[PDB]
């Protein structure tokens, strides 16, 4: 979800920057912020790779500033979470309950072909065992 919203925010920021940079005829162009150039600027800002051009208007500068703050927070969060993942090892069991085995199907499960466990599952009134059996 974070990656999807990052892509959406990138598209929205690029469009808003292009609009506020070139919509006004009284600014005609003094700047070089076309839609392609705006997308390039936003992509470079997100990857922290600088820019060949920078917005000069107040609105374009507000857009650039909020995008820069967003990028800083997001990149720092990615680095911090990757560090946390590489530091701490969390091995979890995909199955920890009887009902979980019934719900899924990737992991198989079986009992003795002749024994008490067979009769336990063959004759049972709990919902889970019948779904299992």
């Amino acid at each position: 979800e974070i990656w999807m919203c990052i892509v959406f925010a990138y598209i929205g920021v690029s469009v808003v920057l292009f609009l506020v940079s070139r919509f006004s005829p009284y600014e005609w162009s003094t700047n070089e912020f076309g839609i392609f150039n705006s997308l390039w600027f936003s992509l470079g800002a997100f990857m922290q790779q600088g820019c060949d051009i920078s917005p000069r208007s107040l609105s374009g500068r507000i857009v650039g500033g909020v995008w820069w703050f967003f990028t800083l927070i997001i990149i720092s969060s990615y680095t911090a979470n990757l560090a946390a993942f590489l530091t701490v090892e969390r091995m979890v069991s995909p199955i920890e309950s009887a009902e979980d085995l019934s719900k899924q199907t990737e992991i198989a499960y079986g009992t003795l072909d002749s024994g008490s466990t067979k009769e336990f599952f063959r004759r049972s009134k709990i919902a889970v065992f019948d779904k299992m059996w």
């Binding site: 979800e1 925010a9 598209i11 292009f18 609009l19 070139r22 979890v92």
Partner: protein, 198 residues
């Protein structure tokens, strides 16, 4: 060309509006196991109600309760504000309204050829609709994180439906159309200046 640009803008605006309207109405927003009319079973959660899937009571569209006051808990004000914002679905609805206004502005632009400010208003409405759709998606996912069934992808493995992706596709088209509307506004003013030069 002016004609092909207008045709593409109108088609894209209509497609984005239709996609947003379908996404708001349809209930295939999220796949998650839940209880109808609060037995748990796989369900397709939407925006207002969730219907049971492959269950004993399949087809029962239980309304989504956005205020779980069972324990009579309030916590902080921000949580209540977010819950109220999600419950009204103010931002997807606002995106739909803005898309409709942009479409009507585009339609009225043909009638009033000399008024170029209408096309700019349509572009602004389309961009604002995209922004509102982004806000709605963010609020929806954040409120979904509150309940375990819509969270914990490790065990629950919730899946987003086509209705949610219809809204995601609606945002992209609306932003694409907003670029075209601003481009046509720029072309119209450039032509006006070019004519005045002669």
């Amino acid at each position: 060309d002016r004609g092909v640009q207008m045709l593409l803008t109108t088609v894209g605006a209509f497609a984005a509006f239709s996609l947003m309207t379908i996404a708001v109405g349809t209930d295939y927003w999220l796949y998650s196991r839940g209880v109808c009319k609060t037995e748990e079973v796989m369900t397709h959660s939407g925006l207002w109600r969730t219907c049971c899937l492959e269950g004993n009571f399949k087809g029962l569209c239980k309304q989504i309760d956005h205020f779980p006051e069972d324990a009579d808990y309030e916590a902080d004000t921000a949580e209540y504000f977010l819950r109220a914002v999600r419950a009204s679905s103010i931002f997807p609805i606002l995106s739909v309204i803005l898309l409709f206004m942009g479409g009507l502005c585009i339609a009225a632009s043909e009638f009033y050829k000399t008024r170029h400010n209408i096309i700019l208003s349509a572009g602004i409405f389309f961009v604002s609709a995209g922004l509102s759709n982004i806000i709605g998606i963010i609020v929806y996912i954040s409120a979904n994180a509150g309940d375990p069934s819509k969270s914990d992808s490790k065990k629950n493995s919730y899946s987003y439906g086509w209705s949610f992706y219809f809204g995601a596709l609606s945002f992209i088209i609306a932003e694409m159309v907003g670029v075209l509307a601003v481009h046509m506004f720029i072309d119209r003013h450039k032509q006006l200046r070019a004519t005045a030069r002669a």
